[PDB]
Amino acid sequence: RFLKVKNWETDVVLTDTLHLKSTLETGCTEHICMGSIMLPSDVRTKDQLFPLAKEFLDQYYSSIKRFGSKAHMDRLEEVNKEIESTSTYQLKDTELIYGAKHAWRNASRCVGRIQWSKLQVFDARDCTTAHGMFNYICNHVKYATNKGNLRSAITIFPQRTDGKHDFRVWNSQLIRYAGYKQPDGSTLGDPANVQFTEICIQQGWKAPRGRFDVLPLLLQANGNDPELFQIPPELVLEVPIRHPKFDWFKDLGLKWYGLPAVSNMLLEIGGLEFSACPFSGWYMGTEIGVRDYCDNSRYNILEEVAKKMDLDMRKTSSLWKDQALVEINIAVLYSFQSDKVTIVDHHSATESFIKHMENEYRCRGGCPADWVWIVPPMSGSITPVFHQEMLNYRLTPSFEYQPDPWNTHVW
Amino acid sequence: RFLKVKNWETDVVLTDTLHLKSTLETGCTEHICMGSIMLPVRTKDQLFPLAKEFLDQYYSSIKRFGSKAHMDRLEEVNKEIESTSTYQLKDTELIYGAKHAWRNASRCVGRIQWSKLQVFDARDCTTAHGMFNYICNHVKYATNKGNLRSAITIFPQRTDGKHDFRVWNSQLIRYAGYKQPDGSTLGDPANVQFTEICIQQGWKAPRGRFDVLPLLLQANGNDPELFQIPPELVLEVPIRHPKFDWFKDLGLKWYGLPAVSNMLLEIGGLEFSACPFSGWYMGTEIGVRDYCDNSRYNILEEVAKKMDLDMRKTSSLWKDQALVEINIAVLYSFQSDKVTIVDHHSATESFIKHMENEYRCRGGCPADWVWIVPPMSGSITPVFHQEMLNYRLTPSFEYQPDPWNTHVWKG
Ligand code: HEM
Ligand code: HEM
Ligand SMILES: Cc1cc(N)nc2cc(-c3ccc(OCc4cncs4)c(CN)c3)ccc12
Ligand SMILES: Cc1cc(N)nc2cc(-c3ccc(OCc4cncs4)c(CN)c3)ccc12
Ligand SMILES: C[C@H](O)[C@H](O)[C@H]1CNc2nc(N)[nH]c(=O)c2N1
Ligand SMILES: C[C@H](O)[C@H](O)[C@H]1CNc2nc(N)[nH]c(=O)c2N1
Ligand SMILES: [Zn+2]
């Protein structure tokens, strides 16, 4: 039960003991593996909350080499008293930063976690309003963008109290392109965002009705009705997409935004629930070129590219889709690199992640990792993670999925 | 208790009740997923319940559950077990068991074909020479001058584990690999260890880059014996590219018939340790894995060089670009020679149709996403966005340790 993981390309074998510190459940059993289910899974009672806090504080004071010390047992008793009275408690700034960095470190589906300890944590727990939320988010966007030299950052709004005062960012990402249904049949813009683009218009947004319309922010503070805000265009760094060999690639009129900033997950630390916590890093190239541009329920521009390449699109066996997919992804990296916007290719990121796995097994005894999500969506087996056995388990602090607010909001 | 899976590209949801018929374990727990782990002497005590389960299944399939033919067969198997400690399958039961072992193979993307399996009963076989003759006939039937036909040949079952029939080759047809004194490898690096055993057993190695290996066959627990498959039975395909004239000059070829021979077939508690089976190749098995894996023929560089790509930075996606061309050449070569092959697009589309049909008429289809998704262009195939449930049903094909590690040598 001190488990082992083998890399079948290198025979490197790592021994995993970290998983024995795992708390939450995977969704699997001994009779069924749910490893490819997208999503398994109204406040903590006074009783379940203190053990959660103790476990978090225990692991915090160990990290700073002060387990079982004056400061440890004092803080333990101090939190204990606050929970007894207030029915909740507040994290010290130090615990907030540690909690956030480790929620990313424990994100078993994230290939970028080698960077986990270089996270810029913005404490927005003093925020009271959507305008205030919008301010914190503009500052996040500007700081993270850094004129193309991207920097990882998270902004943490007040924690849930009773589920009635929730702070929520209704957008799935801070920056996403609009999607409009067409009267004839097709979809203009980004099909992934069609329902949200409706809720925005259905809330008062005047849509330019283009391909690359940056969506407004829909910010919900303290549980009130959300409010629309327009991100200043000068804060939205965008890369025009061209190909280093094909001049007709420009004519496609494609661009993408430089900042991936996910805004709909929930950050859990020591039992406390931060329902608004947008976090951002930088893109792996395939996240745009493979998924955003070539998924059938997305931009789906594969056919148009292969046509312009004069490829034989009559039989799948010509691999014209694969040929185009590569060129599209070559262009994305060329364009970002040309404009000095941070981006990483799938070979670099997976090689980094194997090294990160090395470190985590060495200095921590393991690293939870979700093979189904770590392997890039193209050229899987020529990347090092394909031949790496991985163990998946849920550690805390964590980022968790949460319902879309409009399905829940008492409007 | 029912279970749902969702295709996130089509929003089709399916309901799995078949997982309730699951017996064996997956390796997962409530707290760990072993979904990416490559691989996570039987007495009368536990044999009749396994037989009864199989026979209940079998007679259900022929709509004779509870018939006198069913009850008589149960009794007949019982008496044979308490008397002889094992039992013999009827031909009908053997054919059913073999077809369902394939139908239950959760890592096999080709299972749309599972019911068109040609089953060769080799249970009267007694010697390695007889094994050679049975395998020769399998190869000729299966190859069918390029119009490939799925087939399996079933040798006598295990008795006391000291008289096993084994095929020591991992596939019936595979190329030798030779480690040179300078550290390089001539031939297929995947086969260096088996090649060395063969040479040690008396095989005269041509020491070429595509030498078909000899058959190493073990009957009734005796030491294995060497045989050369007649060269006219081994259909091979020279690999050329439809646009790149220089591609032929790499001197590449591959064999046409994939025939896996180191697995164990389990049916009603009986263990068939030698049971080679064969179908036809999906293109990526050769062009992605066999040619481009770093630990295989690893022709990526040579192809990239001859294409004159930017091999300096990996972000030029030269590896991705050469991988597509190589897989184009493999498909073009097989199709031009009218040797059955399927591309990864056609095969994954079929599997989705197969899987939906299985959910309808069977209540489920065990599926291993980690293995079903092709090793290139994953997200542009439809299985990528398909949730799958993985569980173990019997009859089944299982892994078994290589015989040279367990075999007791006669001398
Ligand atoms: C710095 C560069 C980063 C890269 C290249 C990166 C890469 C990725 C990729 C490719 C995925 C798969 C998602 C998909 O395929 O759509 C992912 C998932 C994820 N990333 Fe990272 N990431 C980065 C930074 C971060 C940061 C700063 C955080 C939080 C502080 C984070 C948290 C997550 C989470 C929570 C998931 C999904 C986990 C789940 O759904 O359970 N990432 N990442
Ligand atoms: C007819 C055409 C077939 C195709 C195109 C096909 C395709 C595949 C592929 C691509 C894999 C993954 C192996 C890898 O990529 O390394 C696989 C696995 C497998 N195939 Fe099929 N297959 C076919 C026929 C058959 C037949 C006839 C049998 C047995 C009677 C079979 C049994 C299996 C098994 C048992 C596995 C997985 C072994 C494991 O659990 O590790 N296949 N198949
Ligand atoms: C910081 C950062 C940088 C980056 N470069 N990439 C990221 C991708 C993610 C992520 C997490 C879950 C997803 O899951 C999709 C679902 C929608 N509904 C149920 S699951 C997706 C898909 N974009 C992305 C999160 C953060 C990222
Ligand atoms: C009949 C048929 C047709 C085909 N077209 N393809 C096949 C691939 C397979 C298979 C199953 C597991 C494998 O891998 C197991 C392991 C490797 N290392 C540790 S377990 C491999 C690798 N050759 C192949 C088996 C049968 C196939
Ligand atoms: C560690 C990992 O499970 C291993 O490399 C698997 C992944 N998926 C695979 N999928 C297929 N089709 N074939 C393989 O050999 C593998 N190898
Ligand atoms: C059905 C399947 O689980 C789903 O498509 C998952 C698979 N793997 C993924 N992997 C990544 N990195 N991102 C994704 O969105 C998905 N989608
Ligand atoms: Zn699992």
Residue B28 to residue A29, Cβ atoms within 8 A: yes
Method: X-ray
Would you say residue B410 lies in a domain?
no
- Which ligand minimizes its atom distance to the CA of B344? 2
Question: B368: which residues sit within 8 A by CB, 6+ positions away?
Answer: A33, B35, B106, B107, B388, B390
Å from CA of A36 to ligand 7 middle: 8
H or E stretch at B267: strand B264-267
User: Nearest CA of chain A to the CA of B315: how many Å?
Assistant: 6
Please tell me the residue having the least CA distance from ligand 1 atom 17. A110
Partner A contacted by B380 (CB < 8 A): yes
Please tell me the residue having the least CA distance from ligand 5 atom 8. B371
Would you say residue B408 lies in a domain?
no
Q: Which residues pair with B49 in a beta bridge?
A: none
* CATH number of the domain that residue A203 is part of: 3.90.440.10
**Cα–Cα distances in Å, from B242 out to B236, B305, B327?**
18, 18, 11
Total domains in chain B come to: 3
Categorise residue B259: left if φ over 0, alpha if ψ from -120 to 50, beta otherwise: beta
Residue A325 to residue B377, Cβ atoms within 8 A: yes
Give catalytic status of residue B108 as yes or no.
yes
Residues B45 and B155 reside in one and the same domain: yes
Chain B residue with minimum CA distance to A348: B314
Rounded CA-CA distance A273/A277 in Å is 10
Residue B387 to residue A9, Cβ atoms within 8 A: no
For residue B140, the tally of other CB atoms under 10 A from its CB is 14
Would you say residue A396 lies in a domain?
no
Residues B27 and B116 reside in one and the same domain: yes
Structure-block tokens of residue B350? 């079929």
* Helix A70-86 vs helix A46-63: crossing angle, to nearest 10: 160
Å from CA of B202 to ligand 7 middle: 45
| Residues flagged as binding site of B | 36, 108, 171, 280-281, 285, 370-371, 384, 399
Residue B27 to residue A33, Cβ atoms within 8 A: yes
How many contacts (CB atoms, under 8 Å) link A and B? 204
Q: Which residues pair with A217 in a beta bridge?
A: A229
CB-CB neighbors (< 8 A) of A322 in chain B: 324, 327, 376-377, 380
Rounded CA-CA distance A105/A177 in Å is 29
Residues A20 and A119 reside in one and the same domain: yes
DSSP B50-67: HHHHHHHHHHHHTT-TT-
Residue B327 to residue A330, Cβ atoms within 8 A: no
DSSP class of residue B31? S
CB-CB neighbors (< 8 A) of B2 in chain A: none
Rounded CA-CA distance A256/A331 in Å is 12
User: Nearest CA of chain B to the CA of A213: how many Å?
Assistant: 23
Residues A35 and A156 reside in one and the same domain: yes
Å from CA of B38 to ligand 5 middle: 7
Residues B154 and B33 reside in one and the same domain: yes
Would you say residue A382 lies in a domain?
no
Please tell me the residue having the least CA distance from ligand 5 atom 5. A387
Our measurement of the distance from residue B59's CA atom to the centroid of its chain's CA atoms, rounded to an integer in Å, reads 27
* CATH number of the domain that residue B330 is part of: 3.90.1230.10
User: Contact, A305 vs A290, CB < 8 A?
Assistant: no
| Residues flagged as binding site of B for L-arginine | 171, 280-281, 285
Nearest to A234 by CA among A205, A211, A217, A214: A214
* CATH number of the domain that residue B73 is part of: 3.90.340.10
**Cα–Cα distances in Å, from B147 out to A170, A390, B235?**
56, 39, 11
Residue A281 Cβ contacting ligand 3 at under 6 Å: yes
Provide the edge-to-edge strand list for the sheet that holds B225-227: B166-167, B215-218, B225-227
Residues A191 and A67 reside in one and the same domain: no
Instruction: Provide the b/e sequence for B306-325 (b: ≥16 CB within 10 Å).
Output: beebeeeebbbbbbbbbbbb
Give catalytic status of residue B111 as yes or no.
yes
For residue B58, the tally of other CB atoms under 10 A from its CB is 23
Structure-block tokens of residue B270? 């009986």
Residues B38 and B85 reside in one and the same domain: yes
Would you say residue B97 lies in a domain?
yes
Residue B280 Cβ contacting ligand 2 at under 6 Å: yes
Rounded CA-CA distance A123/A247 in Å is 46
Residues A156 and A138 reside in one and the same domain: no
Residues A120 and A60 reside in one and the same domain: yes
Range of the structural domain that residue B335 is part of = 236-258+281-346
Ligand 4 atom index nearest CA of B399: 20
| Residues flagged as binding site of A | 36, 110, 173, 282-283, 287, 372-373, 386, 401
Nearest to A349 by CA among B378, B364, B315, B297: B315
DSSP B147-207: S---EEEEPPPPSSSSS--EE-SSBSS-B-EEE-TTS-EEE-GGGHHHHHHHHHTT-----
Residues A215 and A275 reside in one and the same domain: no
Would you say residue B186 lies in a domain?
yes
Å from CA of A386 to ligand 5 middle: 7
Structure-block tokens of residue B309? 């790509």
- Which ligand minimizes its atom distance to the CA of A152? 1
Please tell me the residue having the least CA distance from ligand 6 atom 8. A373
Sign of the CA dihedral with A41 first, then A47, A53, and A56 last:
negative
Residues 26-55 of A with CB under 8 A from B: 26-38
Residues A156 and A221 reside in one and the same domain: no
Would you say residue B2 lies in a domain?
no
The set of long-range contacts for B204-209, using a CB threshold of 8 Å and a minimum separation of 24, is: B205/B176, B205/B178, B206/B176, B207/B178, B208/B176, B209/B175, B209/B251
Q: Is residue A39 exposed (0-12), middle (13-18) or buried (19+ Cβ within 10 Å)?
A: exposed
Residue carrying the six token digits 């008795």: B159
Residue B33 to residue A393, Cβ atoms within 8 A: yes
Nearest to A53 by CA among A15, A31, A82: A82
Å from CA of A295 to ligand 6 middle: 12
The catalytic residues of A are 110, 113, 282, 287
Structure-block tokens of residue A238? 């965008």
- Cα of first residue to Cα of last residue in chain B, in angstroms, is 56
Residue A36 Cβ contacting ligand 6 at under 6 Å: yes
Structure-block tokens of residue B234? 């081994």
Residues A359 and A333 reside in one and the same domain: no
Rounded CA-CA distance A87/A45 in Å is 8
CB-CB neighbors (< 8 A) of A24 in chain B: 31
Please tell me the residue having the least CA distance from ligand 3 atom 26. A262
Which of A38, A111, A378 best tests ligand 6's pocket when mutated (most atoms within 8 Å of CB)?
Answer: A38
Which of B39, B107, B278, B281 best tests ligand 2's pocket when mutated (most atoms within 8 Å of CB)?
Answer: B107
Cite the DSSP H helix spans in B201-343: 283-284, 291-292, 300-307, 318-336
Please tell me the residue having the least CA distance from ligand 1 atom 23. A112
Would you say residue A302 lies in a domain?
yes
CB-CB neighbors (< 8 A) of B35 in chain A: 28, 33, 35-36, 371-372, 392
> Strand B396-398 vs strand B341-342: parallel, antiparallel, or unpaired?
unpaired
Chain B residue with minimum CA distance to A373: B370
Structure-block tokens of residue A385? 């993670």
Residue type, A292: D
Residues 282-311 of B with CB under 8 A from A: 283, 288-289, 292-295, 300
Q: What is the 3-state secondary structure (H, E, C) of chain A?
A: CCEEEEECCCCCEEEECHHHHCCCCCCCCCCCECCCCCCCCCCCCHHHHHHHHHHHHHHHHHHCCCCCCHHHHHHHHHHHHHHHHHCCCCCCHHHHHHHHHHHHHCCCCCCCHHHCCCCEEEECCCCCCHHHHHHHHHHHHHHHHHHHCCCCEEEECCCCCCCCCCCEECCCECCCECEEECCCCCEEECHHHHHHHHHHHCCCCCCCCCCCCECCEEEECCCCCCEEECCCHHHCCEEECCCCCCHHHHHHCCEEECCCEECCCEEEECCEEECCCCEECCCEHHHHHHHHHHCCCCCCCHHHHHHHCCCCCCCHHHCHHHHHHHHHHHHHHHHHHHCCCCCECHHHHHHHHHHHHHHHHHHHCCCCCCHHHHCCCCCHHHCCCCCECCCECCCCCEEECCCCHHHHCCC
User: Contact, A79 vs A71, CB < 8 A?
Assistant: no
Nearest to B30 by CA among A25, A36, A16: A25
**Cα–Cα distances in Å, from B122 out to A181, A344, B103?**
62, 55, 21
Question: B229: which residues sit within 8 A by CB, 6+ positions away?
Answer: B135, B136, B139, B172, B173, B212, B214, B215
Please tell me the residue having the least CA distance from ligand 2 atom 40. B107
Question: A329: which residues sit within 8 A by CB, 6+ positions away?
Answer: A285, A286, A289, A290, A378, B317, B320
User: Nearest CA of chain B to the CA of A126: how many Å?
Assistant: 36
